[model samples]
Target: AKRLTKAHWFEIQHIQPSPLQCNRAMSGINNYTQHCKHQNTFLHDSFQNVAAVCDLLSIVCKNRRHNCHQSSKPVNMTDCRLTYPQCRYSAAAQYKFFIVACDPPQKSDPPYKLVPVHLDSIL
Candidate 1:
């Protein structure tokens, strides 16, 4: 695990003016401390930002043969870096998470980046 930086903590405070009050009030949301000082304050932290530092590496994407060698394979984001995203794939057969490291967009590619990110796991 990695240490939580000050900036990360700042984000927590900025997002949730009262991280405690709401976190305590809401019995359902366990994401990111889980928040509402700001819009989309929930942070969707369920699986992605749980740790400031995390394990790195990619795996065979759930898309499998449907995508390219890059697409078929994995990146940290697609490898279920975030649990909610992981569930998103399993829950819907039509939904597949694609990483951007595969290179530029392709005609056959999905409408958006599966992981919606550019950075892959640390090399």
Candidate 2:
């Protein structure tokens, strides 16, 4: 089995504070510690399974596919070509969490880059 060492949770804050303030705040908190609660839930909630998360994320990220012609597939860890240490959840796994937390994608114009971000893992 693979384990995640460090990951990033790419979030779109509805309100954009000054970059200086945001950067300062991000520096203070250990990113991993911030999502400890969610990580625990994600680890334990077998019924809700990571696959489910992947499925949801696939729907959200469908538009961002580099090749639109290919049939849609869930974003798995392998999808992003990420290795075990680089990320905890597979590309698919991260997609799921993104879907659950962010729900619908941000209402931005298309041709966006929906790259997988590394989320911090709680110890």
Candidate 3:
């Protein structure tokens, strides 16, 4: 059994920030002792749809890692930028092709032998 990692928690916090609420969406993330994520993004696509990328052709990540994969089609998404003082988020929605890191599927993840474990980037 593969233990859950930050990548897993990232899946929980980010996959689909639905009902389209940025602040409310972010509140679901467990910040605990740490400060709010300076900048965060959420994919508007379904977990199953996003997970599909793991099986796509493997490619190099921006950081030079070979585990990343890029979606063949653009996906709806939102970007949340944190502002000072109130922890408010400036949110914007758009569609773009994105990249993700694939790894052995976690038990908690959607049905697949390989699954997206991290959001690498979006174009």
Candidate 4:
């Protein structure tokens, strides 16, 4: 049988979804959030407030040193809040889509932008 947690009645709390939501995990992963370090802070701090099922997120693998491949899926309606400081293919670096929703910088360091890989290609 299929799960109906999204649109089903919550017999326990007498509410459809109650105040909380449920989500499923993928294989080759753990049930905890990733924790990579950055300037005295964990890298995936921003991912803490993500919504459930964010297919458009951009997180770094927490296990970057172990080479988790800066790849992944993000919570809905958000972006990778961090940029690479020389590439972190860690566990927490899951959502690694170099999605750019802004104009490229004209030779200036900007906040939250992907590390360009082409010969000054603009997206």
Candidate 5:
């Protein structure tokens, strides 16, 4: 269930990069544990759109694994650098192709035979 949990966390943390909706999405908390995440990134796209990468030809992961896939085109993204005292964030919009590591065919995660569970890299 680790991979399943990882897949869910990735979706919850990165699927929608809406600073305007941050208050609602985050529930006034910084992270599941701890005061706040020092930094975070979000893809301004749908889960299916991002999950589709798992079907792409696999590529070498930065750590030398072959379970990685890169997005064929650039997608919108946002990076949030958390600032202390009040747990606020500094946001930056970006457009780039992202690489992620996928897990083989999970039992349920919907239309995906391979689920992207880790954000490997970006370019």
Candidate 6:
């Protein structure tokens, strides 16, 4: 699925055999900020809030870097929320689309477990 625009209210709908299946199907895509520093801060400050939710659910969390041709673009909604409006608009308008996804930790097993954590876990 292509990235949804702000006009879409940044909402993503699941269309698959199941919501879990949708997440798995979209797992291959990178959907977070690429800048490592930004990622750390984001995870530390925002992800901490919902750590318990993930722990309870046994969901592996990940941060997939967004693929912006330029570094000026915001990686995802969190970045957009922190960024200036001008920059956000510019990035959104300039980039054809933004990349985003949850980068859950890898699992090793025959069943291939893919934990479904709350979105807030990786803000």
Highest TM-score, which number? 3
lDDT of 1 by residue, 82-107 (tens): 21211221111122323222322244
Cα lDDT tens digits, model 3, 33-119, are 246666778888777778788888999998888989999898888888886224678888889999998888656665576777788
Q: What is the lDDT of residue 66 in candidate 3?
A: 91
Cα deviation at 98, candidate 3, in Å, is 0.3
Error of 5 at 8 (Å): 0.9
lDDT, candidate 4, 1-123, per-residue tens? 133221111111111121221111111011121332221111122321211112334333333222112224422221122221232321232222222112222343222232211111111
Candidates 3 and 6 compared: the better one by lDDT is: 3
**Over 4 Å off in model 1, which ranges?**
1-4, 7-37, 43-49, 58-123
What digit string (tens of lDDT, one per residue) describes model 5 on residues 1-123?
Answer: 223466777787778834444434454335465476776678887888888998999999999989999998998888777652256667778899999898865556664688888899978
How many clashing residue pairs, candidate 5? 0
For each candidate in turn, the TM-score is 0.17, 0.18, 0.83, 0.14, 0.81, 0.18
Candidate 6's error at 9, in angstroms? 20
Alpha-carbon runs more than 4 Å astray in model 3: 1-3, 17-19, 30-33, 84-86, 107-111
C-alpha lDDT of all candidate models, in order: 0.27, 0.25, 0.76, 0.21, 0.75, 0.23
lDDT of 3 at 33: 23
The TM-score that candidate 1 achieves is 0.17
Runs in model 4 with CA error above 4 Å?
1-71, 78-105, 111-123
Worst 10 residues of 6 by lDDT: 84-93
